[PDB]
Amino acid sequence: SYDSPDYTDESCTFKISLRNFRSILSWELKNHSIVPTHYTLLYTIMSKPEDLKVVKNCANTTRSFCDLTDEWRSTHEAYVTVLEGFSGNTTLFSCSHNFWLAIDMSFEPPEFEIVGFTNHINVMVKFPSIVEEELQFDLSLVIEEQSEGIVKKHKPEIKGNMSGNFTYIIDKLIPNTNYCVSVYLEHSDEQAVIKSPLKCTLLPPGQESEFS
Amino acid sequence: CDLPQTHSLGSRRTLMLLAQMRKISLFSCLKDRHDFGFPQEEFGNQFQKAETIPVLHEMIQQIFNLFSTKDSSAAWDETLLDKFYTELYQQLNDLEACVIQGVGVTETPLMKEDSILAVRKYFQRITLYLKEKKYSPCAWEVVRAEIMRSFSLSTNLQESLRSKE
């Protein structure tokens, strides 16, 4: 028992996950006594906090998530998130927070594989078949490599590498090196470490019989 | 003149000072939704190598005068503004330094004045809004937000060397 009692009646914990260049936000609100089933999601920018814009299909819906791929198309401006929850026919909450796509951008859904060779790692991140040339977004993708406990962060150029399968060859390794690869991004800081499910692969071991 | 982009805390300091002078938060001011929009077309475009220095100098000159007004000095922290004036002068001195030297600053045609004119009218437009809003607290926050975003679309553009395609 510390600080203030746990207010398990209004969490308002929002989070946005990027599912193949598709901005999808979800809302979390624990219900204590009153349990609302319909919610309305609204958004806006820093430019004008009163410019509350409601999302279509995500208004007075029974869903818990909303997609806004073409709705959220800004990197410089900040997107404000306002969730209006109504219990039946009465307003319950209207928590207003904000998100920064140029700081978070949680990218985890994309599938990635890694072929293990005796002396090199063949990383294959299957990104969506999108044309980066028509994507106004600046960011870098870092391929994490945890081989035999050795943690490394390989950050190559993404110019023409996010338009499909990302091929990255990691060499300079020794036989029998279990490695775990993580797919995360970065922009101007290192607080955007979206360490996705680390896939551990074991390349051909060289712990055979030692002879001449 | 700052030919090599080694390191600089000039514009980075000004931006911080603007945020420090914040009395309130626009996020909590749902009324003054009359934004302006910094003229980035004549700042972040065409000029990205010293060519934007003449514009920056006159731009800060507008900021300096606008914030050195009896209104701003009474709205924001006089102590913070005290340092703000010094920093503004510092940035001004650093920028005009290139003008004093024989650097490629004043070589472009009359378009050099066009960029300044864009900023000039932008600031004048803000002054009018300030008068209309009687220099209200939240109204000042709008100005802060604009100027803060302005720096992020002016001097910050010189550091925006990420993508090249």
Side-chain angles (χ1 to χ4, degrees):
Chain A
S1 330
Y2 260 94
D3 57 279
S4 14
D6 189 76
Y7 271 90
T8 344
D9 70 279
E10 214 168 297
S11 333
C12 294
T13 330
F14 317 128
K15 175 166 275 209
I16 176 173
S17 306
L18 199 71
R19 184 207 283 183
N20 269 22
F21 68 73
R22 294 171 177 174
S23 0
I24 302 174
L25 29 78
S26 314
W27 42 85
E28 201 83 82
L29 25 284
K30 306 294 171 48
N31 304 142
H32 223 52
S33 321
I34 318 170
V35 189
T37 217
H38 91 261
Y39 317 101
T40 304
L41 201 274
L42 289 93
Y43 66 85
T44 190
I45 43 177
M46 175 208 186
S47 164
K48 9 179 163 24
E50 200 191 3
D51 214 78
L52 306 174
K53 184 185 181 184
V54 60
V55 204
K56 298 171 69 182
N57 169 79
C58 321
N60 46 271
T61 178
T62 338
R63 284 196 139 194
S64 31
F65 72 98
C66 166
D67 78 278
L68 8 83
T69 317
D70 224 272
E71 273 58 77
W72 278 36
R73 282 173 59 159
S74 304
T75 326
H76 198 98
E77 247 289 52
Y79 271 112
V80 181
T81 315
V82 180
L83 177 73
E84 300 196 279
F86 311 86
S87 322
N89 291 281
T90 311
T91 318
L92 188 64
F93 54 88
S94 305
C95 297
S96 316
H97 289 163
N98 61 273
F99 282 96
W100 270 95
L101 297 176
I103 278 87
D104 190 86
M105 217 53 169
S106 301
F107 219 176
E108 293 188 85
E111 171 196 287
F112 74 109
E113 288 289 277
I114 26 175
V115 197
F117 280 85
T118 323
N119 282 88
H120 56 255
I121 300 162
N122 287 23
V123 188
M124 199 61 48
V125 192
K126 296 88 171 297
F127 280 121
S129 14
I130 178 80
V131 191
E132 328 165 351
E133 295 191 279
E134 306 182 294
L135 188 62
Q136 191 165 212
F137 236 94
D138 214 315
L139 73 155
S140 354
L141 215 291
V142 194
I143 304 296
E144 209 168 64
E145 179 220 338
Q146 214 266 31
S147 35
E148 234 285 288
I150 308 170
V151 194
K152 294 182 178 185
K153 43 166 164 165
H154 299 267
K155 47 170 195 176
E157 310 202 271
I158 326 302
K159 312 125 77 66
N161 285 97
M162 198 177 62
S163 15
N165 54 92
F166 201 131
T167 310
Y168 198 65
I169 314 298
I170 314 174
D171 59 275
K172 290 172 179 293
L173 312 156
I174 45 168
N176 195 30
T177 26
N178 72 93
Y179 62 91
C180 244
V181 169
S182 333
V183 181
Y184 69 99
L185 39 83
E186 61 117 65
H187 187 198
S188 311
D189 213 283
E190 280 192 285
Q191 286 166 86
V193 276
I194 319 296
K195 205 190 288 271
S196 31
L198 294 87
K199 194 161 287 182
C200 268
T201 303
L202 176 72
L203 52 96
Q207 46 163 147
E208 313 301 302
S209 354
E210 50 160 277
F211 287 115
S212 299
Chain B
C1 183
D2 279 282
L3 269 301
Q5 46 158 89
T6 26
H7 70 95
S8 184
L9 276 175
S11 9
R12 300 185 188 161
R13 178 84 50 72
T14 350
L15 202 145
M16 183 175 59
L17 272 155
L18 284 154
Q20 289 178 269
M21 283 186 296
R22 273 214 305 160
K23 255 66 189 65
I24 47 174
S25 316
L26 184 68
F27 198 92
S28 318
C29 289
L30 278 83
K31 192 65 182 174
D32 282 279
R33 64 193 290 182
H34 288 207
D35 77 297
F36 302 79
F38 178 72
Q40 191 229 94
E41 76 284 326
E42 231 81 90
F43 228 115
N45 275 40
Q46 284 297 145
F47 321 112
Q48 205 176 28
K49 185 66 179 293
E51 321 276 326
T52 198
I53 288 174
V55 201
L56 279 165
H57 190 269
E58 267 55 272
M59 170 187 175
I60 298 178
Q61 264 287 329
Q62 287 291 88
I63 299 172
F64 179 78
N65 176 74
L66 196 75
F67 279 79
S68 202
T69 52
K70 306 186 67 58
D71 305 287
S72 305
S73 304
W76 313 109
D77 253 270
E78 67 148 76
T79 308
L80 282 174
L81 270 169
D82 182 270
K83 258 312 309 299
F84 195 53
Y85 301 145
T86 319
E87 232 67 277
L88 293 172
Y89 246 103
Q90 173 70 41
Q91 271 81 90
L92 284 169
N93 285 331
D94 267 307
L95 295 171
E96 64 187 61
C98 305
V99 184
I100 308 167
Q101 273 92 83
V103 197
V105 185
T106 0
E107 196 200 84
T108 19
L110 287 172
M111 73 186 296
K112 61 179 178 184
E113 198 64 41
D114 261 334
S115 1
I116 298 168
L117 280 164
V119 183
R120 183 182 184 150
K121 179 56 73 71
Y122 167 62
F123 272 73
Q124 184 61 92
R125 172 183 167 183
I126 297 177
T127 331
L128 263 60
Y129 184 72
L130 279 167
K131 303 193 301 145
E132 184 182 38
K133 254 49 167 42
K134 284 175 177 173
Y135 308 93
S136 293
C138 295
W140 279 114
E141 246 299 81
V142 183
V143 183
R144 189 277 307 176
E146 286 280 327
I147 302 305
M148 178 178 173
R149 241 62 168 89
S150 295
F151 265 104
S152 311
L153 289 177
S154 43
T155 351
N156 177 60
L157 253 288
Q158 191 60 90
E159 297 196 76
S160 308
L161 255 65
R162 278 193 129 264
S163 187
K164 205 180 289 173
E165 34 274 298

